[PDB]
Each structure stands twice: as structure tokens, then as C-alpha cells.
Amino acid sequence: TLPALEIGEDERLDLENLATGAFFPVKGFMTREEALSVAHEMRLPTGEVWTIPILLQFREKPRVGPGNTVALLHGGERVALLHVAEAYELDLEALARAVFGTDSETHPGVARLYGKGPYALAGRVEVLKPRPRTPLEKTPEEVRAFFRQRGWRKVVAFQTRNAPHRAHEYLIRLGLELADGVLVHPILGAKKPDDFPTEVIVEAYQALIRDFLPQERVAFFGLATPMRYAGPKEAVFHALVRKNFGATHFLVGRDHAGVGDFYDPYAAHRIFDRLPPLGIEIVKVGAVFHCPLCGGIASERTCPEGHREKRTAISMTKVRALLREGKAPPSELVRPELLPILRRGV
Amino acid sequence: TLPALEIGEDERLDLENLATGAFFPVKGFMTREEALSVAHEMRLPTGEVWTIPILLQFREKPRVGPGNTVALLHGGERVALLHVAEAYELDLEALARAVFGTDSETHPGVARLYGKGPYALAGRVEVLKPRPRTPLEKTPEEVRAFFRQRGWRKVVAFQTRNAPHRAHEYLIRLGLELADGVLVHPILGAKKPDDFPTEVIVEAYQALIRDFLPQERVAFFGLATPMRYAGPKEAVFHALVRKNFGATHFLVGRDHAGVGDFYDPYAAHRIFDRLPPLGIEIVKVGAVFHCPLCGGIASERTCPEGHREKRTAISMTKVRALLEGKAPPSELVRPELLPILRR
Numbered sequence: 001t002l003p004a005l006e007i008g009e010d011e012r013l014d015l016e017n018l019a020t021g022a023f024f025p026v027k028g029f030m031t032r033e034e035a036l037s038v039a040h041e042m043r044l045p046t047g048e049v050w051t052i053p054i055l056l057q058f059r060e061k062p063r064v065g066p067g068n069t070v071a072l073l074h075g076g077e078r079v080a081l082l083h084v085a086e087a088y089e090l091d092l093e094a095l096a097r098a099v100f101g102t103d104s105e106t107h108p109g110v111a112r113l114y115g116k117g118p119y120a121l122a123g124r125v126e127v128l129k130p131r132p133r134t135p136l137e138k139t140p141e142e143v144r145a146f147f148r149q150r151g152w153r154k155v156v157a158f159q160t161r162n163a164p165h166r167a168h169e170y171l172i173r174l175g176l177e178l179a180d181g182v183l184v185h186p187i188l189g190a191k192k193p194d195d196f197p198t199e200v201i202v203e204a205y206q207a208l209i210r211d212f213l214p215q216e217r218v219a220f221f222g223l224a225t226p227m228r229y230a231g232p233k234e235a236v237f238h239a240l241v242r243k244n245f246g247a248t249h250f251l252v253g254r255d256h257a258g259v260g261d262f263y264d265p266y267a268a269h270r271i272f273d274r275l276p277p278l279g280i281e282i283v284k285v286g287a288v289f290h291c292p293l294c295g296g297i298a299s300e301r302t303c304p305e306g307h308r309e310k311r312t313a314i315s316m317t318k319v320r321a322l323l324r325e326g327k328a329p330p331s332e333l334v335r336p337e338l339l340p341i342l343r344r345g346v
Numbered sequence: 347t348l349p350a351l352e353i354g355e356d357e358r359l360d361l362e363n364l365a366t367g368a369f370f371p372v373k374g375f376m377t378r379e380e381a382l383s384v385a386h387e388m389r390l391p392t393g394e395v396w397t398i399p400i401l402l403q404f405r406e407k408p409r410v411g412p413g414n415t416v417a418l419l420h421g422g423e424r425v426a427l428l429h430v431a432e433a434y435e436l437d438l439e440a441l442a443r444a445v446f447g448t449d450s451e452t453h454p455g456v457a458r459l460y461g462k463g464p465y466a467l468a469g470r471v472e473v474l475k476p477r478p479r480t481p482l483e484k485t486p487e488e489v490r491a492f493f494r495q496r497g498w499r500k501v502v503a504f505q506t507r508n509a510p511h512r513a514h515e516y517l518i519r520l521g522l523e524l525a526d527g528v529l530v531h532p533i534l535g536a537k538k539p540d541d542f543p544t545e546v547i548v549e550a551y552q553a554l555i556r557d558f559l560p561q562e563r564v565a566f567f568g569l570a571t572p573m574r575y576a577g578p579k580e581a582v583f584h585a586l587v588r589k590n591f592g593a594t595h596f597l598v599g600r601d602h603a604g605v606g607d608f609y610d611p612y613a614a615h616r617i618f619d620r621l622p623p624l625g626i627e628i629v630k631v632g633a634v635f636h637c638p639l640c641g642g643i644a645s646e647r648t649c650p651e652g653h654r655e656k657r658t659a660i661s662m663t664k665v666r667a668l669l670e671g672k673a674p675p676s677e678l679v680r681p682e683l684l685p686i687l688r689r
């Protein structure tokens with residue numbers, strides 16, 4: 001029998017994203033050269049833009065090498081086949097600094113990386129036992145087909161790892177105003193502890209879409225891959241992957257993909273300035289909040305400096321704090337109708 | 347002394363717009379082939395896209411002809427020189443049906459056209475006595491400079507002929523999210539009776555901009571030309587002109603440059619689909635209204651069909667004709683702007 005190696009969920013999700021073209025142009029778990037150039041130069045050796053290393057890691061060096069075909073185990077059964085193209089070890093700390101901007105294990109993304117081990121295997125993979133998908137978890141080809149069918153030419157994608165608050169909804173509405181349709185694409189893979197569980201994200205968005213948005217033009221599908229919380233660099237990753245799903249536009253608000261306040265609020269806007277056109281337009285929007293003077297939800301690009309004093313910040317951190325405290329998040333933060341859904345997963 | 351011809355206010359304004367490049371590629375008052383190609387095939391004979399015929403009309407055929415230099419007179423002096431390159435007569439009715447989509451004198455646009463005379467002259471123009479322009483009445487070149495002065499590379503232009511209402515501000519808001527800056531370019535030329543006077547809109551806007559908008563990123567200048575109310579075609583006109591003022595984007599809402607219910611609310615939207623890339627991006631936005639369920643001013647593209655029966659349409663007509671001593675609801679007009687709307 002073939003040499004076998006157990007693999008976690010992050011791995012099973014990402015080998016599938018590789019095989020489905022979600023991570024195109026990356027086609028297989030990266031070689032050391034690929035990992036390093038991606039991490040330090042934001043390019044693949046061949047020249048294409050890419051910022052997030054896709055790796056198959058292990059805590060103990062595997063008993064396999066170039067040319068071997070290995071069975072990948074998950075959930076007890078053999079799920080896929082790996083065509084090892086290289087076996088190497090990485091200096092995770094150096095890698096984390098380049099990808100996350102810090103090597104502190106206090107960073108959730110950094111911790112997840114370290115936990116997987118320094119031994120890596122590169123190579124293409126073939127899916128044997130596809131993981132069961134729900135109607136929401138559509139493949140890039142299924143999404144692009146969905147767009148063609150409905151005749152959507154201009155499509156703005158919206159990334160998210162949380163339940164929606166009024167600020168998130170503003171981005172979605174901005175998208176609705178500029179495109180034939182908007183793709184709300186929640187991350188379905190592993191997240192840090194204080195993010196809302198996928199089940200409440202799914203119920204919250206379906207309610208927001210069903211009762212407050214044109215159901216007609218809001219495609220709600222899920223992207224199954226972990227959050228890296230790498231801010232600016234993850235933003236580029238998010239945009240590129242959405243491009244593979246058929247999006248022509250990608251929203252990037254305040255502190256896109258950040259953890260706490262480690263990255264500068266708009267570094268994810270700026271990073272695109274230091275990169276070549278990507279084949280998908282970036283729609284940047286500043287901080288979104290509530291303004292009594294303006295008369296409701298607004299942003300820094302539409303609200304006068306003189307209004308500051310009266311602005312009310314909108315963030316899920318505040319929202320969860322309010323809920324964990326027994327208090328009810330105000331109407332200017334979250335919609336009252338979604339509250340029961342949120343209290344349920346806090 | 348050279349031949350003298352009198353000209354109306356409208357004429358004085360466009361002759362300058364022609365010289366300031368505000369109507370590029372339109373050089374000077376077009377010929378007969380030019381007037382027909384534009385009005386029927388939305389193109390200059392050359393090939394450039396253009397929809398509104400720029401004409402110098404007279405109720406009585408001028409005694410001048412090709413090759414002649416004519417002196418134009420506005421008040422009581424020689425405002426500019428005209429190099430007549432052709433003289434002719436036009437079938438105003440057949441010209442109107444093409445331009446405004448009708449020839450019914452009930453149309454504020456066809457009317458003004460008729461009262462100008464079926465006789466017209468063509469040819470380049472040279473200004474000799476530039477009419478006094480306030481700080482707002484900036485020329486195309488003066489506006490392009492104002493943009494580089496602030497480094498605005500992406501500019502969204504907004505066309506308006508009335509006072510600011512919530513739906514108007516909405517479109518300006520949208521522009522502020524898409525570009526480094528937004529150009530609010532009110533029409534300073536002649537408008538029909540019901541449209542708010544330049545004076546009031548000018549004072550209402552800078553009050554809005556000052557107390558409710560990024561004072562720093564909202565350019566408020568006026569375009570000195572008359573309103574044609576040509577609906578869709580005037581929309582293309584507005585687009586191309588604002589392009590010359592340096593805007594990269596142009597906003598077009600519901601029933602843009604329309605009158606009563608003459609044109610289909612979205613005709614000014616579809617017309618761009620039948621034209622080639624203009625060199626300026628058209629930002630289409632549907633009906634804008636108030637919605638309690640959405641929680642404020644939303645649009646046909648952001649408010650679901652199921653909220654319809656709760657929407658509160660926004661129109662400057664109702665407002666204007668409602669101070670009947672009434673008071674426009676907050677969800678349609680900013681209260682802080684009534685003292686200006688009333689006066």
C-alpha cells in the first residue's frame with residue numbers, strides 16, 4: 001500500500017481549493033522557493049502576484065520524498081493523493097515575520113502556522129473522497145456559471161469572517177449600487193475564538209438579505225478556507241481568490257483581515273498601490289460609522305471632520321462586548337431584528 | 347465697419363463655452379451637415395460623439411455669407427467676432443423631433459428653440475469682450491487646474507439644475523465614496539420658471555457642503571449654459587462637457603434632464619449603451635427615495651421590492667409647490683435648509 005499521512009481540516013479544505021482553481025495560479029502545495037518568494041516578494045517564482053503561502057506542514061519529518069505518491073488521511077479515511085515534488089523544512093519565525101509582520105505567537109495566524117510544524121511537502125494533489133458540501137459552498141466554476149446564468153457582467157465581491165453589522169451592510173450596499181450583483185462570500189474555515197461561528201454568520205446574513213436587501217441581486221456563497229488574519233497581505237489573497245470566482249470587483253474596507261489593532265487601518269488599501277494591476281478592480285472604502293448629523297450610516301469619505309465628536313464607531317468587538325455584558329447593541333450598530341441571531345452565538 | 351448682429355443671452359454663453367473648449371470637439375456653431383448628423387446619428391460629420399446641436403439662430407436671415415467676418419453684439423458693444431463659414435435655414439420641427447424626441451411646443455425645450463428663428467450661421471468664434479464671471483463661473487481650463495492643484499486624479503461630476511434635496515445629496519455621497527473629489531456643477535444658464543433660482547440653490551448648496559459634507563472634497567462651480575430638457579441626449583451632452591472640465595466620472599440618476607414625464611425615467615441610462623466609450627465613466631444610479639425599513643435614503647438598487655409600499659418618493663416639484671404653507675418632511679429635505687428654500 002501507499003505511504004499514508006494524516007492531515008487536518010485546514011489541509012483538506014485547501015487541497016480542495018487548489019484542485020478547484022480557487023487558489024489559481026497556485027496549483028499545488030508550494031516548494032520552498034515558492035513559499036519564500038511569495039512571502040518576501042509577493043510573487044511566485046514565475047512572476048505572478050501572490051501573497052499567502054499555501055503549505056502542507058508536519059511536526060515530524062515525513063518518511064517520503066520526491067516522486068512518491070502519498071495517501072492523505074482525514075476522518076479515518078483516505079481523502080486524497082499527494083504527488084510529492086519536494087521535502088523541506090522551514091524557518092517558521094522568519095516566514096511569519098514576512099507574512100504577518102510579526103513572529104509573536106500571540107498573533108492567531110502566527111500561532112496556527114507554528115502549530116502545524118516546520119516540515120513541508122510540496123506537490124499537486126488529486127481529490128479522491130470529496131468533502132460533503134452544502135448548497136452554499138460552491139466551487140469557483142459553479143459560481144462563475146451562476147454569474148453567467150443570471151447575466152451579471154459587473155460583480156463586486158464582499159469578504160467577511162463575521163456576522164453583519166450596519167457598517168458591513170454599508171459596504172454591501174455600496175457594492176449593490178455599482179454592480180449587476182454582489183457576492184457575499186463568508187469565510188467558512190477556522191477562525192480565532194471571538195469571531196462569530198459560521199452557523200450564526202449564515203443565519204444572520206440570510207435574514208439580512210431576505211428582509212433588508214434585494215434578495216434578487218445578492219448571491220450568498222461560502223469560501224471554505226481558514227482566516228490568516230494577515231491584514232494587507234491577506235487582503236490581496238482575498239481579492240485574487242475572488243477573481244477566480246468570477247468577481248470583477250472587490251471591496252476592502254477598514255483594517256481588512258486584521259487582528260485587534262496590529263495593522264494600520266488602511267495598510268490594506270495602500271498595499272495595492274505597490275502592486276501591478278491584478279485583473280480585478282479594488283473598491284476601497286474608509287471607516288464606516290453612524291453619524292447623527294449626516295443622518296445615519298456614513299464613512300470618512302462622506303462625513304465632514306467637524307462631525308467627528310458625534311460619530312459612533314461600529315465594530316463587532318464592541319458589539320460582542322455589549323452582548324457578553326447582557327446589554328443590547330444599539331440600533332446604530334446592529335439591526336434589532338438580527339439581535340436574537342447574534343445573542344445565540346456569543 | 348463690419349456687419350453687426352444682435353445675440354441673445356443663450357448665444358453669449360455658448361459662444362464662450364465654444365472658445366473655452368467646454369464643448370470640445372465642437373469648435374464653433376456647427377454647419378447644416380453638422381446640425382443634422384449630430385441630431386440624427388449622434389455624431390459630428392467627423393466621427394466624434396455629440397448629441398446637442400450648437401446653433402446661432404435668427405428670426406430673420408442675416409445679410410452675411412461665407413468668408414465674411416461678422417461682429418456680434420450682446421448689450422451695446424462688440425462682444426465677439428464670427429467667421430461665418432455657412433448660412434442656412436433649418437426645419438425646427440424636424441430638428442426638434444430628433445433632438446427632444448418631440449416637436450410639441452408644450453416642451454420647454456422645443457419652445458425656446460422655435461422662438462430663436464429658423465435661420466442660422468456657422469463658423470469659428472473669437473471673444474473680444476469676455477463677460478464678467480464670478481468665482482463660481484470657472485472655465486474648463488480653470489477647473490482642470492483646480493484639480494491638479496489638489497491632486498485629484500479621479501473626479502466624479504454631478505449635474506444639477508435645482509436646490510439640494512436628500513436624493514441629490516445621496517448621489518453626491520456616492521461620488522464622494524468613489525473619487526478623490528466630487529464636482530457639483532450647477533447649470534447657471536436659463537432654466538424654466540419652476541426650477542429654483544440660481545441665487546437660492548447657490549446659497550443652499552454651500553450651506554449643505556459647509557455643514558453636512560467634506561467641505562474639503564466638494565468642488566462647487568457653475569456651468570454657464572442653458573437647460574435644454576432634452577432628457578437622454580442632454581445627458582450625453584452633460585457627460586461630454588463635464589469630461590472637458592476634467593471629470594473622470596459622471597453621475598446620471600432617474601429621469602436625468604427630463605421634463606414632466608416626457609421621457610422614460612431610465613432613457614438617459616440606456617442611451618449610453620447605444621454609444622461607444624466616451625472617455626468618461628458614466629455612473630448609473632436608479633430612483634432614490636426614503637425607506638424606513640432600510641433605515642433612510644436608499645435606492646432602487648439597494649432597497650428590495652418588498653419595501654416598496656413604504657418608500658417616500660423624493661421630488662423638488664412637490665417640495666417647491668408645498669411652501670402652500672406646508673413643511674417638507676425631514677426624510678426628503680434637510681430642515682436646516684428651509685430658511686433658504688423659502689426665501
Ligand SMILES: Nc1ncnc2c1ncn2[C@@H]1O[C@H](COP(=O)(O)OS(=O)(=O)O)[C@@H](O)[C@H]1O
Pocket residue numbers: 159160161162167168171251252253254255256257258285286287288289314315
Ligand atoms: N467599521 C467598518 N468600517 C469600514 N469597513 C469595515 C468596518 N468593519 C469591517 N469593515 C470591512 O468590511 C469587510 C468586513 O470584514 P470583517 O468580516 O469584519 O473582517 S475581515 O477579516 O473580513 O476583514 C472588510 O473589507 C473590512 O475591512
Ligand SMILES: Nc1ncnc2c1ncn2[C@@H]1O[C@H](COP(=O)(O)OS(=O)(=O)O)[C@@H](O)[C@H]1O
Pocket residue numbers: 505506507508513514517597598599600601602603604631632633634635660661662
Ligand atoms: N429622486 C431622484 N432619484 C434619482 N436620481 C435623481 C433624483 N432626483 C434627481 N436625480 C438625478 O440627480 C441629478 C439631479 O438632477 P436635477 O437637478 O433634479 O435635474 S436635471 O435636469 O439636472 O437632471 C440628475 O443626475 C438626476 O437624474
Ligand SMILES: [Cl-]
Pocket residue numbers: 210
Ligand atoms: Cl420573504
Ligand SMILES: [Cl-]
Pocket residue numbers: 254255256257258
Ligand atoms: Cl476587522
Ligand SMILES: [Cl-]
Pocket residue numbers: 258259260261317
Ligand atoms: Cl479583532
Ligand SMILES: [Cl-]
Pocket residue numbers: 271
Ligand atoms: Cl508590503
Ligand SMILES: [Cl-]
Pocket residue numbers: 640641642643644
Ligand atoms: Cl440605508
Ligand code: NA
Pocket residue numbers: 092093114
Ligand atoms: Na518557533
Ligand code: NA
Pocket residue numbers: 102104106107262
Ligand atoms: Na499580536
Ligand code: NA
Pocket residue numbers: 438439460
Ligand atoms: Na415652427
Ligand code: NA
Pocket residue numbers: 216651
Ligand atoms: Na424583484
Ligand SMILES: [Zn+2]
Pocket residue numbers: 291292293294295298302303304307
Ligand atoms: Zn457626519
Ligand SMILES: [Zn+2]
Pocket residue numbers: 637638639640641644648649650653
Ligand atoms: Zn427599503
